[PDB]
Amino acid sequence: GSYRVIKQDDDLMLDEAQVWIEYGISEDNKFYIKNDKHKFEFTDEGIYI
Amino acid sequence: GNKTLIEPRIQKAPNMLFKHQGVFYDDGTPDNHITTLFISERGDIRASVLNTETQKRTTQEMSSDGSYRVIKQDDDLMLDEAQVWIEYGISEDNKFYIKNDKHKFEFTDEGIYI
């Protein structure tokens, strides 16, 4: 039950992607937006980057 | 052929669904993954994945009013009376939000609120 949207620019396979962006709901209850740089996460309590 | 329209017999809108399930597979473990693509008569769309034995569900719901909503549950299959859950999407009113058991993160048409 993990919502996930992934976009890739230079690799069709999901594995071994250099340039990409992701955002959704992981297998654990954590809303996040992540890329090659450090991510933006919204845990059940508080705001972290 | 004689230039008359082919009227449908039933004018009431239908409700579709693509229910998927099994029994077992080559790994030997019992199959308990249920997923649906239910569509209501009022235009709603609900894509859901379910594990019934473990009591876990993740739904992507669309309302007739046009409300984007994705819900994940950990201990209750029914949407009603959920303790542990997380939601994020577009409510019936124009407000982008991410909410859980703790206080939510909302993005109104103007400003940022928590």
UniProtKB/TrEMBL annotation, chain A:
The chain holds residues 262 to 310 of 848 of the full protein. This is GP-PDE domain-containing protein. It comes from the Viruses.
Automatic annotation (TrEMBL), chain B:
This is GP-PDE domain-containing protein. It comes from Staphylococcus phage 812. The chain holds residues 197 to 310 of 848 of the full protein.
